[PDB]
Design a protein around this nucleic acid. Sequence first.
DNA 1: CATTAGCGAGAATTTTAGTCACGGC
RNA 2: GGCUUUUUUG
DNA 3: GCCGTGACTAAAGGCAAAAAAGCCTTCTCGCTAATG
Lengths: 237, 50, 100
Amino acid sequence: DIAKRIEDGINQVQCSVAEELAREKFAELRAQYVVTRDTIKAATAQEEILKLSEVFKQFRLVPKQFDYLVNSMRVMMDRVRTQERLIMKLCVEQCKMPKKNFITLFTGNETSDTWFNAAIAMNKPWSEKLHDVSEEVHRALQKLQQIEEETGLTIEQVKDINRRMSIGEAKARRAKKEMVEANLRLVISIAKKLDLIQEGNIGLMKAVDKFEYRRGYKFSTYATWWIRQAITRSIAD
Amino acid sequence: VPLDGGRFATSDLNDLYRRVINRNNRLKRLLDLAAPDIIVRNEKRMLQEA
Amino acid sequence: MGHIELASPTAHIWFLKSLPSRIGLLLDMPLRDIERVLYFESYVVIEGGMTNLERQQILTEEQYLDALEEFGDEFDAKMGAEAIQALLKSMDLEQECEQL
DNA sequence: CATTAGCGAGAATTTTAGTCACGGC
RNA sequence: GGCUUUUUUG
DNA sequence: GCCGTGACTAAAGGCAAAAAAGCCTTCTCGCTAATG
C-alpha cells in the first residue's frame, strides 16, 4: 500500500515535467506533439495537453531520462530563485523591510516593472528613497523579462509546477525514509550469519526501494536475496 | 616510549588520534557506497563528539 | 606537520563554547540551538526563500517534513557543520557591519 | 599418544564572575 | 620515562 | 516592554623536594606449546 503513494508522487512529477526501437514509443508522443502546438497557440488547450502528457506516462523507458527532464526544468526555477534572492538582497538586506509586502507587490507584478514604483506609495521611508537601488532593482528585471520570454510560460504557472513536482518528490522521499528505518531487525538477524552487520544493511535500501506492490514473495525473503548477496561473494571483499 | 618487555607505553594523544582516524575512515568507506541516511547521522554525530 | 582529511566539515569547539560564543554573537542565535543544529537532532533551515520560513529559523523533524511536503525544493535546509559553514559563507561581512 | 589452552596478531566544597531566561510596574 | 596513587621534609 | 531579578554555569584553589608502589582498551582463533 505504501508503494502506491510513491507511484502517485512519481505520476505527479511526471505531470509536472510533461506540462525505431526508441521511436515506436515516441510515436504516441508525436501523434499529438505537433497537433497540440496550434491548439495551445490561441479549454481545448488543457483538454488536449492532458492527452499529450498522459501518453508520455503510458510506457516508462528509462528513469535517467526522467531525471534529465527534472534537472532541465530545475535550472529554470534555479535562475528564478536566483533572481528572487538577488532582489531580496537588494531590498530587504540593506533596507529594513518586513518582506511581507512582496506577497502584495512582487507576486502580483512579476513582469510588471511597477511594483518597485508602487513601493513609494505605501511609505516605507527606505522605499521612499529607493533611488539608486530602484535602478539596481529593475536593472535585474531587464534580465527577468527576457528570461520569462525565452521560457515561454507564465511565472505563476512556473511556481505552481515547481510546487507540485516538489510535493511529489517530497512525498516519495518521505515514504522511503519513513519505511526504511523499520527494517533493521531483519537486517541484523540475517547479518548475524560489525562490518558484516553494516554490509547487511547496505543492500537493505536497494531491496526496500525495489520492493513493488505487484510482488508477493515475502519482503523479508525478497530482501534475503540481496542481503545474502553480501555473504555470497563480497563477504571476503 | 618502550618500557621493559614487549609492551609499549601509550600516551593519551595517540589513542584519541587513533579513535578519530578510525571513525573518519569508517565514515569515508561507508559514504562511498551511499549508505542509508540514518546511519550517517549517527556516525557524523559521533565523529563530532570524537 | 601532519594533516587528516575529514570526511565532512566539522565545527570547532572553542569558538563555540567560550563564555561569549563567537559564532553565537556573529549569527545572533542562542548557544543552545547551535549545539542541537550541530548534533543533527534538530532540523534547521539555511534559506527560506519565497516561502514563509525565516532564513535563520530553527525547526524539528515534524515541522521540516510538513514544510518539506508543502514547499520542499523552494526552501533550502541542511544539517550540521556543513550547514553552519554554508550559512557563514553566505553571510557577508561589510553589509552586516554597515547594518549594525 | 591424544586433547586442549593460548596468544599474536588482528580487529571493533568555596568563592567569584559572567551570562541567560523570566517577570514586574 | 610518562601518568596515577600514597607517605614524608621544610 | 526594558531593566531587575534570580537561576545556571565556567574557573581556580603553593612552593620546592624526597620515598615508595602500579599501568599503557578488550574479544577471537590456528599451529605451537601446555596438559592429561
